[PDB]
Amino acid sequence: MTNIEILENMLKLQQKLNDETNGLNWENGYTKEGKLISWRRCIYMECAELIDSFTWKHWKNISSLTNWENVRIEIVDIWHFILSLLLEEYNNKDFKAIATEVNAVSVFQDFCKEEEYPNEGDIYGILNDIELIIHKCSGFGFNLGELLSTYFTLAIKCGLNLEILYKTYIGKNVLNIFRQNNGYKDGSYKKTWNGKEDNEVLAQILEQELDFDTIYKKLEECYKKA
Amino acid sequence: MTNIEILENMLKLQQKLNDETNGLNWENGYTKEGKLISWRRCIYMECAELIDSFTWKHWKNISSLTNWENVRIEIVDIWHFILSLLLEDFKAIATEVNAVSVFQDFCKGDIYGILNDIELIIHKCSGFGFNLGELLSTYFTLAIKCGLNLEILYKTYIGKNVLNIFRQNNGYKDGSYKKTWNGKEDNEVLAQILEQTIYKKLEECYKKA
Ligand SMILES: O=c1ccn([C@H]2C[C@H](O)[C@@H](COP(=O)(O)NP(=O)(O)O)O2)c(=O)[nH]1
Ligand SMILES: O=c1ccn([C@H]2C[C@H](O)[C@@H](COP(=O)(O)NP(=O)(O)O)O2)c(=O)[nH]1
Ligand SMILES: [Mg+2]
Ligand SMILES: [Mg+2]
């Protein structure tokens, strides 16, 4: 698959998931149940989850190491919401055009190369990069291009590349569907499965498996034992 | 009590807590263990907790109602960090706070509006260039909308300040503290105690976690 094909595939997956979650024409700003959609708030709330994957608190668990497994999950959650904002921001949707525009972001090319492992000395800078995303998404707006650039730069610093993002995205997209199919809206969903959060179980599954439908089935099996 | 006394007391309690937690001269930006302090980050992270006290998500638990108990706790957590910024004597600081026009009103629904005020605080705490005075006004405007007044802030602040000391005395720093006590977050147990010396209750309660 070309870089643009990978991006088109994620956009198409995001569209389908949003359509199923929110109803058609969620792009107009509300779900079918009348709830306001704020993709920017979604993003800065995942940014808070991302920050909490690091030992940023000066008063709590100060010798603990970075949770890099969760870092990757939160980077992927952010991406779901950025894809959503791309689709919202814009009858006939041209996914290839959108993909082509994302592909032209200067740092995207760098994102497509092999990932580098981060280390403790990178955390200060990573936290400041996340803070910039929070700032951009909490104001008036807002520039979608600067957001993409800042996002890919952050994702590189966090040890992701397009490959890791894509494969993890697919898995989380499946879990997102699973959640909606199992009581996420009405509060009946159990997010902890025999002591592990669903994201952690998904990560275990992803160590082996990439196939969309196989992932769903495996989630189903594990959730029976939740 | 007068408003100035209430403010001075909070500022005094904050200094004590920060001294005990971080060591003397935390005002220079580092803890005794050499960790960099960012009060603004502390604030926007509590803002996230505050947002999460409302049914903001369009895709999850969409019929749930606001957790006003937790709203009060997060408004109080934000206040600890604002006091820390103010401090980063007490009479003069209290005098400035008391002069904030919205503060006077504070001494006396619309969830998406509340959320927008929280968002403004997040925005102000995450940019390059910061104004503490403007944050104060936004904060008290929000706290009114959340149903607090000075009395509620002050009484809840005292209680959480006690929990904060308790935490530090019981392994918060080294990861041995249990933050969930027999199925309830420590903040929820605190809230139950505050319906009703606080430190002794916490210590007794902590025994069965
Ligand atoms: O309209 C929506 C709403 C949610 N999500 C997904 C994206 C993200 O992957 C996830 C975040 O769900 P959450 O409820 O914040 N839980 P967690 O952050 O632990 O995944 O929800 C969408 O893709 N579209
Ligand atoms: O230097 C510090 C560090 C922390 N805190 C307090 C303020 C706040 O009340 C609490 C927040 O701690 P937390 O670990 O974020 N946990 P929670 O938000 O659940 O109370 O910590 C201070 O007062 N000073
Ligand atoms: Mg989330
Ligand atoms: Mg998370």
Ligand SMILES: [Mg+2]
């Ligand atoms: Mg997340």
Ligand SMILES: [Mg+2]
């Ligand atoms: Mg907190």
Ligand SMILES: [Mg+2]
């Ligand atoms: Mg909280």
Ligand SMILES: [Mg+2]
């Ligand atoms: Mg809090």
